[PDB]
PDB file of C-alpha atoms and ligand atoms in Angstrom:
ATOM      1  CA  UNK A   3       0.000   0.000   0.000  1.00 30.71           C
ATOM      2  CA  UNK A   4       2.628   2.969   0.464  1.00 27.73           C
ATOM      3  CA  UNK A   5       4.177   4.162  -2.175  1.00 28.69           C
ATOM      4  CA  UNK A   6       7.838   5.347  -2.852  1.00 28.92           C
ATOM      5  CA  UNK A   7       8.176   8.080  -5.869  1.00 25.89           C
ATOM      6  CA  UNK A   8      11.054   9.324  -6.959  1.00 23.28           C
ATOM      7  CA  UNK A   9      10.917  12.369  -9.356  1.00 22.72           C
ATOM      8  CA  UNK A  10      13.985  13.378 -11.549  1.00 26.30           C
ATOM      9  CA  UNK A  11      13.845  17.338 -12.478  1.00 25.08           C
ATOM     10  CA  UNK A  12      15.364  18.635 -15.854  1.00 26.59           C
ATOM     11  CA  UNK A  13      13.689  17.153 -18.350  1.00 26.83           C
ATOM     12  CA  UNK A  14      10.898  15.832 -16.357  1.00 25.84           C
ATOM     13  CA  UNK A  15       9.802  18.231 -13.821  1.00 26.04           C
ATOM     14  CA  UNK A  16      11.024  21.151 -15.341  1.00 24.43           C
ATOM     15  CA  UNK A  17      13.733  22.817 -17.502  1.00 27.84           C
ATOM     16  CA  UNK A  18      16.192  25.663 -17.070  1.00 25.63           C
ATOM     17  CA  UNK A  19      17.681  28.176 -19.873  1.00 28.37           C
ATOM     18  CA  UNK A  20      20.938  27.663 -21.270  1.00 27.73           C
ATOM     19  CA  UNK A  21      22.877  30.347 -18.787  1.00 28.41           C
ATOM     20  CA  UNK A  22      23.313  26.818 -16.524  1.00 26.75           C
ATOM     21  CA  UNK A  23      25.931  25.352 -18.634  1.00 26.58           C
ATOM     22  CA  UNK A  24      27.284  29.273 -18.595  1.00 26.72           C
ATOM     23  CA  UNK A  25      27.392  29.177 -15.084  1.00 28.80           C
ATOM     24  CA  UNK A  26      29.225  25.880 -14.740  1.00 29.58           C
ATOM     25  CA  UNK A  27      31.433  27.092 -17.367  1.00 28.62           C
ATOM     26  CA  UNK A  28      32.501  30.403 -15.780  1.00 26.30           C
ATOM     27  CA  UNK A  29      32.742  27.783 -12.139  1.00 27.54           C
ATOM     28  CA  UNK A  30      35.197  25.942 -13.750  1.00 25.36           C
ATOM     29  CA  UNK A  31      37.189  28.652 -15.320  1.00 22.85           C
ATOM     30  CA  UNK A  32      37.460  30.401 -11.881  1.00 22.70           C
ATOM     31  CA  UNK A  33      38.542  26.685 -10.089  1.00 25.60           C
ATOM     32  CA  UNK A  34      40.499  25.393 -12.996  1.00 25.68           C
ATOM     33  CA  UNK A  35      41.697  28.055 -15.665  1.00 27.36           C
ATOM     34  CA  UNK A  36      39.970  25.869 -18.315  1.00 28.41           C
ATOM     35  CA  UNK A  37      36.410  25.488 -18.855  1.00 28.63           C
ATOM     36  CA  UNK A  38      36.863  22.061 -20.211  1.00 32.43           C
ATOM     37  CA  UNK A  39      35.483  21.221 -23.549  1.00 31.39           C
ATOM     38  CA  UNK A  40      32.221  20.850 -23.062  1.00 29.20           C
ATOM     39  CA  UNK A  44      24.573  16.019 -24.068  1.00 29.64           C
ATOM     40  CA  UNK A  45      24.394  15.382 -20.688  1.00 30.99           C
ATOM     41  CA  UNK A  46      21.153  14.884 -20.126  1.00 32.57           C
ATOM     42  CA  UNK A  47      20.556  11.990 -17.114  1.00 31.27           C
ATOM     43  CA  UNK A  48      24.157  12.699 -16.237  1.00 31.27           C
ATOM     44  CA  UNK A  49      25.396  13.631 -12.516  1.00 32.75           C
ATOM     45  CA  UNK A  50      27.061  17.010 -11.895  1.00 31.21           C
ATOM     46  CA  UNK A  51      30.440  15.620 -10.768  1.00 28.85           C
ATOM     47  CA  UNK A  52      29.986  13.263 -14.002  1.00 27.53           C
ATOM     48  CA  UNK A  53      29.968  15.602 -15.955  1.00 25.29           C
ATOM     49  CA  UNK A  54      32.496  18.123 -14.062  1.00 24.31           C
ATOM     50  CA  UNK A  55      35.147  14.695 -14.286  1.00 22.52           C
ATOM     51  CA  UNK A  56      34.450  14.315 -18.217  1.00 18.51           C
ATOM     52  CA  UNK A  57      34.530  17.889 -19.337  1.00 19.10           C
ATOM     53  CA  UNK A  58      38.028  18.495 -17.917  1.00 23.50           C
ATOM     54  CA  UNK A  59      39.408  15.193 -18.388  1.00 20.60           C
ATOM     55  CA  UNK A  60      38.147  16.027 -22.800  1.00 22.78           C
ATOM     56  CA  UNK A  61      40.869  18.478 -21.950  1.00 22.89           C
ATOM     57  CA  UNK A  62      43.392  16.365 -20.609  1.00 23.16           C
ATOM     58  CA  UNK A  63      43.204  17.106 -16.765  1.00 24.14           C
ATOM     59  CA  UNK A  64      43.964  13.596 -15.036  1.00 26.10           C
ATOM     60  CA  UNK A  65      41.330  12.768 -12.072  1.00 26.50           C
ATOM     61  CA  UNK A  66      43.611  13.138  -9.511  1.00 27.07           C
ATOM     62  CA  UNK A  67      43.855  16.674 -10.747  1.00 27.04           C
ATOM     63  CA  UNK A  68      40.295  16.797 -11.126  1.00 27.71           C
ATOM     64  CA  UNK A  69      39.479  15.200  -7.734  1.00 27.17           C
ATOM     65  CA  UNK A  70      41.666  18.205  -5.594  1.00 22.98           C
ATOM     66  CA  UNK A  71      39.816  20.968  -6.576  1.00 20.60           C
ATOM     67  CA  UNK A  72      35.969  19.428  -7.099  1.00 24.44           C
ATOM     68  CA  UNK A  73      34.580  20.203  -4.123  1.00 24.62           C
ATOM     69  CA  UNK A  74      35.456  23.664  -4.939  1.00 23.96           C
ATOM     70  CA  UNK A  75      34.477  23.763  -8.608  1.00 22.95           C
ATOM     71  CA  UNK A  76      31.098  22.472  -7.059  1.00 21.02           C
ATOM     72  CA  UNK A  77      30.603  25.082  -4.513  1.00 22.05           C
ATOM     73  CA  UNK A  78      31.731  27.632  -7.055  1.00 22.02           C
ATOM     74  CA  UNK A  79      28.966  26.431  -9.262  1.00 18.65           C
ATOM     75  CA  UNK A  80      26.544  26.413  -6.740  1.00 17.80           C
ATOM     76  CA  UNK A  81      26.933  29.608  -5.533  1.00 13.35           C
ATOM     77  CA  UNK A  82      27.199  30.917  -8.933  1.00 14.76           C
ATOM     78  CA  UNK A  83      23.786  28.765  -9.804  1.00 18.15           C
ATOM     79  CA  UNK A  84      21.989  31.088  -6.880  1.00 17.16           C
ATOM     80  CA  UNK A  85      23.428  34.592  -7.712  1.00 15.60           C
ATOM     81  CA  UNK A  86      22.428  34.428 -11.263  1.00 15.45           C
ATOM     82  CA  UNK A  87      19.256  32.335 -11.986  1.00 18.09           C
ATOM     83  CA  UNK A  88      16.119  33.675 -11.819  1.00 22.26           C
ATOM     84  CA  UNK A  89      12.629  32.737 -11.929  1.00 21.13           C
ATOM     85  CA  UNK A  90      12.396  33.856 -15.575  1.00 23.79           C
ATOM     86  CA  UNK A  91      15.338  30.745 -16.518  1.00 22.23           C
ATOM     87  CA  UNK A  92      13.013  28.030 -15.313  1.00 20.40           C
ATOM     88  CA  UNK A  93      10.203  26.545 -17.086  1.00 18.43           C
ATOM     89  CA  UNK A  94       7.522  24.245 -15.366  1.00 20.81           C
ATOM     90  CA  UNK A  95       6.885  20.713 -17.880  1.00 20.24           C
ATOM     91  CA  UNK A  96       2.951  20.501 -18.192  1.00 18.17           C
ATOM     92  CA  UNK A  97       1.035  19.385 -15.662  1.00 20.25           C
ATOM     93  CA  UNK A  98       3.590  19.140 -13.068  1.00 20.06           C
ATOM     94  CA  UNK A  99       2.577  21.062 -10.339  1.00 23.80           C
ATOM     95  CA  UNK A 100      -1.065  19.308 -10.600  1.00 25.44           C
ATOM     96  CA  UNK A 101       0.441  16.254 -10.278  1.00 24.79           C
ATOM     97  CA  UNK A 102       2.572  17.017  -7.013  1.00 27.35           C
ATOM     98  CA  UNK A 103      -0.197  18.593  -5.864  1.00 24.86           C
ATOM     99  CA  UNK A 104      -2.339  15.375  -6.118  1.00 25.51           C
ATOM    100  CA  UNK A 105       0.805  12.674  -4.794  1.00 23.76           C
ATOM    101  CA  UNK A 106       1.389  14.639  -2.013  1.00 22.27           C
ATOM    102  CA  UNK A 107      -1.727  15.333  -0.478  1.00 23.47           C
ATOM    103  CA  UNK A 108      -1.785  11.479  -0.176  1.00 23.58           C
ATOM    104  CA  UNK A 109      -0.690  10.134   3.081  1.00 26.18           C
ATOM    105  CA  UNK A 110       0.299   7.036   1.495  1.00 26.51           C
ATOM    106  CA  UNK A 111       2.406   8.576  -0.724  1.00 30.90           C
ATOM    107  CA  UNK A 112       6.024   9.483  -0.103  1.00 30.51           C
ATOM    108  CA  UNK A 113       7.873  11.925  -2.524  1.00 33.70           C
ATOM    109  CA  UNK A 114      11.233  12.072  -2.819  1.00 34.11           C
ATOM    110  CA  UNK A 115      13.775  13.580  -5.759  1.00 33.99           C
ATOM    111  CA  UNK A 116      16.539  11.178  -7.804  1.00 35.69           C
ATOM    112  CA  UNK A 117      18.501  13.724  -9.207  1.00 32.29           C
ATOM    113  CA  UNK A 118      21.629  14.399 -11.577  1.00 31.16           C
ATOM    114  CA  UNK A 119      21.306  17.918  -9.696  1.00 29.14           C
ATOM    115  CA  UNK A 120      23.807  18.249  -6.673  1.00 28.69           C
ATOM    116  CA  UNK A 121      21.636  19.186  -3.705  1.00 28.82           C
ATOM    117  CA  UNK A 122      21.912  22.953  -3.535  1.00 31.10           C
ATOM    118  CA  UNK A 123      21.398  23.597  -7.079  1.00 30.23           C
ATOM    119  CA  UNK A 124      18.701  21.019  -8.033  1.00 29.62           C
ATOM    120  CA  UNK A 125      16.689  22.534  -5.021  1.00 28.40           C
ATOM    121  CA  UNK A 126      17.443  25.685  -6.119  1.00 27.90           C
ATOM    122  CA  UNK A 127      16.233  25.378  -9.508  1.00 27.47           C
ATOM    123  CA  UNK A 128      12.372  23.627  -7.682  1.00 29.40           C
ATOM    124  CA  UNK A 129      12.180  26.722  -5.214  1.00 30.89           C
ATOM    125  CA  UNK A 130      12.042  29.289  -7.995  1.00 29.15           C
ATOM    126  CA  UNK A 131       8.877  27.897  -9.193  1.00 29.54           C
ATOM    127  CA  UNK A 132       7.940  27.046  -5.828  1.00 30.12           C
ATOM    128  CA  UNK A 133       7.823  23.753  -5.935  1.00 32.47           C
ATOM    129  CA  UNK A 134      10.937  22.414  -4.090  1.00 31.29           C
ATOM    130  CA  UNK A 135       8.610  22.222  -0.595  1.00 29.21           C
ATOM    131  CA  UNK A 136       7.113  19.141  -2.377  1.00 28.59           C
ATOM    132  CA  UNK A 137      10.360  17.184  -2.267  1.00 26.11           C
ATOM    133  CA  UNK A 138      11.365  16.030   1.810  1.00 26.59           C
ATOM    134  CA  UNK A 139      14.728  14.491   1.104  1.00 27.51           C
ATOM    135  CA  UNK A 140      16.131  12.680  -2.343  1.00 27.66           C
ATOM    136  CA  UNK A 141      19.303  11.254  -3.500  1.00 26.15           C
ATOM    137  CA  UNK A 142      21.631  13.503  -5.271  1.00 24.23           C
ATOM    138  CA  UNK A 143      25.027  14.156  -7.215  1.00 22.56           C
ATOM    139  CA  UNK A 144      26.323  14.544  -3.942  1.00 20.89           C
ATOM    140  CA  UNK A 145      26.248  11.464  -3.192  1.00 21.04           C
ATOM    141  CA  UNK A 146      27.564   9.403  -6.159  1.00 23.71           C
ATOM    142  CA  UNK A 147      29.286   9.772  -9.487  1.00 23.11           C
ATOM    143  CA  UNK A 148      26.948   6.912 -10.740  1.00 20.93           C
ATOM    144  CA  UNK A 149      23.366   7.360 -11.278  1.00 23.12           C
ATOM    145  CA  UNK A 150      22.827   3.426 -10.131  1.00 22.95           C
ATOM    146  CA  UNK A 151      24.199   3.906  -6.492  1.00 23.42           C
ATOM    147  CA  UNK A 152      21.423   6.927  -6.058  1.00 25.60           C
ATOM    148  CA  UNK A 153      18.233   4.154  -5.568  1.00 25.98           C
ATOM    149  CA  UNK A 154      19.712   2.342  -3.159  1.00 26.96           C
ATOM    150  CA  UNK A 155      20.586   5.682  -1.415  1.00 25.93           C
ATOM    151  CA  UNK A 156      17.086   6.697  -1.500  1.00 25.32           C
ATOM    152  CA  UNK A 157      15.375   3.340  -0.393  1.00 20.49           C
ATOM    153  CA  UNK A 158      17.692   3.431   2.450  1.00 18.12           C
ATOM    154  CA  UNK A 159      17.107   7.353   3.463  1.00 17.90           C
ATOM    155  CA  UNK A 160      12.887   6.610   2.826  1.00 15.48           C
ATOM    156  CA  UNK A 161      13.245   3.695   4.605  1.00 17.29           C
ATOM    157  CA  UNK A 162      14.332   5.268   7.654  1.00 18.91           C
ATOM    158  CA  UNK A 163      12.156   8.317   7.776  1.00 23.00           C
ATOM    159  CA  UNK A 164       8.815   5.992   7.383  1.00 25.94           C
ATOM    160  CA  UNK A 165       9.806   2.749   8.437  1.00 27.35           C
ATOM    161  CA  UNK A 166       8.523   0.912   5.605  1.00 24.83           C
ATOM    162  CA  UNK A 167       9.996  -1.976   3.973  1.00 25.89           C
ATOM    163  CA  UNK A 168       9.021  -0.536   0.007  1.00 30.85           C
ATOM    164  CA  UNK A 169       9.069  -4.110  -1.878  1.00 31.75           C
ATOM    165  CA  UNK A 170      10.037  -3.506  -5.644  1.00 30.37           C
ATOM    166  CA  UNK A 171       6.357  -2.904  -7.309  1.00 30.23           C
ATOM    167  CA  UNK A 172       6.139  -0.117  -4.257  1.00 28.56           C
ATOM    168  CA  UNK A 173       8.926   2.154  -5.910  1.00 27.44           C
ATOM    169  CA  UNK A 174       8.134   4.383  -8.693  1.00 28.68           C
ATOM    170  CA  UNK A 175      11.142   6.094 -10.115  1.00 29.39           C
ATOM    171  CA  UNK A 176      10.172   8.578 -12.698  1.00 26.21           C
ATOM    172  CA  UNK A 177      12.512  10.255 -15.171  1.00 26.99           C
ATOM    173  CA  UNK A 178      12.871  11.542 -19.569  1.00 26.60           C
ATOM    174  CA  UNK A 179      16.269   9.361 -20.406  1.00 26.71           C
ATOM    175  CA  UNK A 180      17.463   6.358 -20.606  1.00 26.31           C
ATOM    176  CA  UNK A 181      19.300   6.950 -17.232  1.00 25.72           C
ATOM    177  CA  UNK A 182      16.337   6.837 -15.716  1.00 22.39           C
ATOM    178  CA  UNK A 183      15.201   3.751 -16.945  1.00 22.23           C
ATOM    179  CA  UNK A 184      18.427   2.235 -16.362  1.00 18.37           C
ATOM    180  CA  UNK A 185      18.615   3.294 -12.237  1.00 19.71           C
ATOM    181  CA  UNK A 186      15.404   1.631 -10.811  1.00 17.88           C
ATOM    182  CA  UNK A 187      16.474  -1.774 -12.402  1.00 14.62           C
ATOM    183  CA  UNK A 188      19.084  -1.630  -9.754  1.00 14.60           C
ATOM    184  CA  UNK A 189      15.894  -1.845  -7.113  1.00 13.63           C
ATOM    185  CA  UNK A 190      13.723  -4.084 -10.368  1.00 10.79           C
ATOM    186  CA  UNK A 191      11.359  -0.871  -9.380  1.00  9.68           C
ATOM    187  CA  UNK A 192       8.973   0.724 -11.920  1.00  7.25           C
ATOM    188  CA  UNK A 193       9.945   2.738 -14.042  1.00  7.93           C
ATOM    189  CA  UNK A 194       7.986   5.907 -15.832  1.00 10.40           C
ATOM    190  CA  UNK A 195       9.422   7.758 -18.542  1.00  8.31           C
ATOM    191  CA  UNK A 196       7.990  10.921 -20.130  1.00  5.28           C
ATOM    192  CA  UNK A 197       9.212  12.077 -22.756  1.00  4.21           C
ATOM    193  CA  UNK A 198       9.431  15.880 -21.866  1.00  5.78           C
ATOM    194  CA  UNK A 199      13.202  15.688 -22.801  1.00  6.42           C
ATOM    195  CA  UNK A 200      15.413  15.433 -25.338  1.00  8.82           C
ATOM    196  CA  UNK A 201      14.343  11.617 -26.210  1.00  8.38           C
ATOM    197  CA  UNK A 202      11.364  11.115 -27.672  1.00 10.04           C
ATOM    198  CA  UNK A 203       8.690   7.891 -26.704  1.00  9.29           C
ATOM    199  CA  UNK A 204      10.660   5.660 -29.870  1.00 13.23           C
ATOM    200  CA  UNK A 205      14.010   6.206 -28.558  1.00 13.62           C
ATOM    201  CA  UNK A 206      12.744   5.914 -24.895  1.00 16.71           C
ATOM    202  CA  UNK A 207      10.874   2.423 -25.867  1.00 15.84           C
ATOM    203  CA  UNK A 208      13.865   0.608 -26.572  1.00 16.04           C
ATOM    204  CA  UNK A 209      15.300   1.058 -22.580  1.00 16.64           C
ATOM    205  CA  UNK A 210      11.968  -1.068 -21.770  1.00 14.77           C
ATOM    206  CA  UNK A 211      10.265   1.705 -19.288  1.00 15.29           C
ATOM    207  CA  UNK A 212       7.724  -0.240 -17.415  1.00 14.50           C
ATOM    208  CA  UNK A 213       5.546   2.754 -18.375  1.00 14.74           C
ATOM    209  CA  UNK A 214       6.038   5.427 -20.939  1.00 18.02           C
ATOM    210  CA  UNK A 215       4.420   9.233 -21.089  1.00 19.82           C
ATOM    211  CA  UNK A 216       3.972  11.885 -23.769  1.00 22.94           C
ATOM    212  CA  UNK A 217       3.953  14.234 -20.573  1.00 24.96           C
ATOM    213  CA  UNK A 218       1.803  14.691 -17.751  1.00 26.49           C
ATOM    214  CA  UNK A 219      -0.968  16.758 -19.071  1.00 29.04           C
ATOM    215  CA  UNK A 220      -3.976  14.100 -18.064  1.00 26.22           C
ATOM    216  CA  UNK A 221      -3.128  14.454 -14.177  1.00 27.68           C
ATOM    217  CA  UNK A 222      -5.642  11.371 -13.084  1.00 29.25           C
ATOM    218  CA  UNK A 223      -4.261   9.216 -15.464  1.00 30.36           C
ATOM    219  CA  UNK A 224      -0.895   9.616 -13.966  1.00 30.37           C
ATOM    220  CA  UNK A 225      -1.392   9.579 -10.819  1.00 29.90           C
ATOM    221  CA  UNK A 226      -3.375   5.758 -11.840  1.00 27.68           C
ATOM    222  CA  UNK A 227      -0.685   5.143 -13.540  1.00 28.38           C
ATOM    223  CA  UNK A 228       1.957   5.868 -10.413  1.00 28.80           C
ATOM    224  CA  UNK A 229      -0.271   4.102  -7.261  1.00 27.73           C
ATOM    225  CA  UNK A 230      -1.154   0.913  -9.331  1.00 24.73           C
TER     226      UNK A 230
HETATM  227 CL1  LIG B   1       9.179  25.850  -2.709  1.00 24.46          CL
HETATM  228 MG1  LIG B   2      16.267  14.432 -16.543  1.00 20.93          MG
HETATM  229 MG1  LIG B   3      46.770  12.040 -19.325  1.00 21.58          MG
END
């Protein structure tokens, strides 16, 4: 009966204008010297941070002593110059969190590419980051397929409950998506609010697969059952 549902954001819950992948260019220059060379859609932060700079010949242990302040930098950079005006909610989103978390058998939670900070930052301009009690994040793994086991373990011990597999809903527009809530055999939504559309999504086997979210009682049918 309670349900686990894990929302991914760009792409899926909403989308930001192209002054991010500015802003992590100008972190990296300030950190670095180099912004790297330079989709990564489904991708984590430091993922992306390590395979940027290492395009450009940086080895990892070169990478690895200045990350953590390449990812502050970015962060803080992230805050200072987005605004409300560089985020666009996907259709029918805020319906559809609306309706999930008014149920008390429901449990939301965020899988992200996003480090923490920034991901959260990016929901609380549109005001709807209060949604989202905890997640897993791109602070805690370079690989997307650690970050379900991170966030069974975290919902786990805020509830109590023992989610089986057909209990977990992870929901997400790549193939990245897909891919992480095998690692729990969990089900899987795509929509395809991304840069994949439903024939390339298809072939990753989702265990369900959206246009987008527009009909908000059919997704929410599609999410509890
Ligand atoms: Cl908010
Ligand atoms: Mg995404
Ligand atoms: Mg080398």
């Amino acid at each position: 009966s309670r349900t686990l549902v894990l929302f991914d954001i760009d792409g899926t819950l909403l989308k930001v204008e192209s002054m991010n992948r500015r802003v992590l260019a100008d972190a990296l220059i300030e950190v670095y010297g180099t912004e790297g060379s330079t989709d990564f859609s489904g991708k984590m932060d430091g993922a992306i941070i390590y395979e940027v700079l290492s395009n450009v010949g940086l080895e990892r242990a070169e990478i690895a002593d200045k990350f953590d302040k390449a990812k502050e930098t970015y962060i803080a950079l992230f805050r200072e110059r987005a605004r409300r005006e560089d985020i666009t909610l996907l259709e029918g989103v805020r319906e559809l969190l609306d309706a999930l978390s008014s149920r008390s058998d429901v449990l939301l939670g965020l899988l992200t590419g996003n480090f923490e900070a920034s991901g959260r930052h990016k929901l609380k301009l549109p005001g709807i980051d209060h949604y989202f009690p905890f997640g897993a994040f791109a602070d805690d793994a370079l690989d997307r397929n650690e970050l379900p086991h991170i966030a069974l373990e975290r919902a786990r011990r805020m509830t109590g409950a023992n989610y089986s597999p057909s209990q977990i809903v992870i929901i997400g527009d790549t193939e990245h998506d897909i891919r992480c809530a095998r690692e729990l055999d969990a089900r899987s939504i795509a929509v395809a609010t991304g840069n994949f559309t439903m024939e390339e999504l298809a072939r990753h086997k989702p265990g369900t697969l959206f246009k987008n979210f527009a009909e908000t009682d059919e997704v929410l049918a599609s999410i509890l059952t």
